[PDB]
Design a binder for this molecule. Structure first.
Ligand SMILES: *[C@H]1O[C@H](CO)[C@H](O)[C@H](O)[C@H]1NC(C)=O
Ligand SMILES: *[C@H]1O[C@H](CO)[C@H](O)[C@H](O)[C@H]1NC(C)=O
Lengths: 495, 16
């Protein structure tokens, strides 16, 4: 019973402002000082393609229940999310906004917003996690279509109608906006490159893939066409409520930590639906990572329960490429999965090989006799061709997790191979630069082996190790094997 | 509830 323009933002943010000396980034990994400076209804630029302005929608699009789950969100950001939905959406299409407070420290963060028109608050009595919280919200939802948003988002002009139009036409489409960037430091709202879509490597964390030449050519042909995507990050999407329920909601055995990308993306595609990015729908999001999760590290274990629950149900034998990338996950308890395996059987879903061939053929699968695969990492750097060809030197370069010049395998024949080129010891004197040369099956100069717990790369039949100490002076070398940081190299997958 | 921290949409600044 307060209309949103009459909500007192100043009093709400209130005593939760950052005191001088307190870390502005402590509450939620973005600058709360800058978030608190903004008005709840602050103007943002219209990042849509100009062709999006030429669209008109029927008044009878199905209304949605917007479900926003949160845990210790910054009050200013939570309010601005809610206001953006209310300000930018035709009111008839917002049946309700359900805030699911997942046991935040202060119940007032959510409760005070319940005074706003259309906003209902459900508070969990313990921290349940995003997926269980979303099931609670979806169960409470009165509308025929569910919209899931995160708690630090800002909806743009006519963001909702394009999403609802897709789902009304075909209930098996699960659709997402193009996600614009709200800068974590200065809160400016900007658009990212149009040539990026969701993806993942074998470690199973969400990443952005650069579109292939074919995908980019297609996009240029119609920059406002819906784009099929192999994976959503899992934060923002719209789904017909009955389809959500029929397909198995979310797995209620998921915990708080991660994996919200995985299970739903695999299940929707394998069980006959699709995922889409809708370019005329724009929602900004406060992205919070500098650098997206890196392995090895503790992330592999932190996200393992939820990740294994997806992998063990959906991925068939391809789960073993995940365990090759994330060996720390192999023995992490993940709970019983018989209910979800029964669901998979009941729904007559396709195998994971079908997903890889038809939905994500860009994900490179190791050859069946590869010894190791992926990128060859040293700190945050990667073995890199530097765009060279035969007779060229090789280098190190910051790992960009985009494949390309950083894509390698240690083959059955013990070669370190990129396309048709192999690392070649052209000169055995210590200190000599190695070169790319065409792969030749019985060239002893092209044979390498992992040593010291798969932490170094030794040239077979020698006491020479791959060494980056020469990088500044021209490229990678062979050097007498020794206890050197510059001789540490590890493939992302050991098979 | 929360999502995990999401990566800013970026990729390599060179071409393969
Ligand atoms: C956060 O990280 C998890 C790790 O399991 C997933 O990659 C998830 O997709 C990420 N969430 C968002 C919103 O990017
Ligand atoms: C782009 O070129 C640089 C060297 O200039 C690196 O080789 C980098 O790995 C390349 N990017 C991709 C995606 O291959």
């Amino acid at each position: 019973k307060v209309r949103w323009p009459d909500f007192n933002q100043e009093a709400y943010v209130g005593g939760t402002m950052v005191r001088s000396g307190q870390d502005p980034y402590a509450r939620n990994k973005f600058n709360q000082v800058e978030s608190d400076k903004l008005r709840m209804d602050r103007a943002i630029p219209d990042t849509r393609h100009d062709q999006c302005q030429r669209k008109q929608w029927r008044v009878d699009l199905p209304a949605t229940s917007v479900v926003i789950t949160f845990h210790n969100e910054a009050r200013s950001a939570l309010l601005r999310t809610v206001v953006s939905v209310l300000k930018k959406s035709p009111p008839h299409l917002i049946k309700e906004i359900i805030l699911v407070d997942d046991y935040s420290n202060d119940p007032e963060d959510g409760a005070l917003l319940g005074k706003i028109e259309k906003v209902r608050v459900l508070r969990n009595d313990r921290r349940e996690g995003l997926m269980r919280s979303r099931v609670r919200g979806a169960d409470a939802a009165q509308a025929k279509v569910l919209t899931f948003l995160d708690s630090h988002c800002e909806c743009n002009e006519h963001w909702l109608e394009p999403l609802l139009e897709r789902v009304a036409e075909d209930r098996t489409r699960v659709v997402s906006p193009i996600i614009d960037v709200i800068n974590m430091d200065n809160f400016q709202y900007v658009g990212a490159s149009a040539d990026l879509k969701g993806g993942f490597d074998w470690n199973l964390v969400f990443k952005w893939d650069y579109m292939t030449p074919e995908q980019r050519r297609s996009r240029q042909g119609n920059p406002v066409a819906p784009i099929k995507t192999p994976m959503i990050a899992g934060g923002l999407f719209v789904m017909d409520k009955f389809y959500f329920e029929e397909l198995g909601k979310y797995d209620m055995m998921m915990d708080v930590w991660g994996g919200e990308n995985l299970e739903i993306s695999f299940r929707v595609w394998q069980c006959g639906g699709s995922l889409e990015i809708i370019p005329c729908s724009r929602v900004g999001h406060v992205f919070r990572k500098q650098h997206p999760y890196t392995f090895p590290g503790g992330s592999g274990t932190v996200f393992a329960r939820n990740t294994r629950r997806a992998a063990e149900v959906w991925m068939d034998e391809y789960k073993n490429f995940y365990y090759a990338a994330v060996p720390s996950a192999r023995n992490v308890p993940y709970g019983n999965i018989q209910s979800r395996l029964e669901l998979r059987k009941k729904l007559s879903c396709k195998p994971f090989k079908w997903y890889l061939e038809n939905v994500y053929p860009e994900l490179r699968v190791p050859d069946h006799q590869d010894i190791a695969f992926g990128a060859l990492q040293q700190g945050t750097n990667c073995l890199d061709t530097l765009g060279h060809f035969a007779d060229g030197v090789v280098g190190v370069y910051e790992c960009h997790n985009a494949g390309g010049n950083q894509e390698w395998a240690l083959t059955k024949e013990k070669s370190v191979k990129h396309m048709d080129l192999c690392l070649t010891v052209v000169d055995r004197a210590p200190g000599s630069l190695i070169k790319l040369q065409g792969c030749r099956e019985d060239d002893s100069r092209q044979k390498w082996e992992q040593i010291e717990g798969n932490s170094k790369l030794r040239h077979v039949g020698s006491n020479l190790c791959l060494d980056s100490r020469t990088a500044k002076s021209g490229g990678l070398s062979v050097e007498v094997c020794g206890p050197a940081l510059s001789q540490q190299w590890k493939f992302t997958l050991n098979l | 509830a929360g999502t995990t921290p999401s990566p800013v949409p970026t990729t390599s600044t060179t071409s393969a």
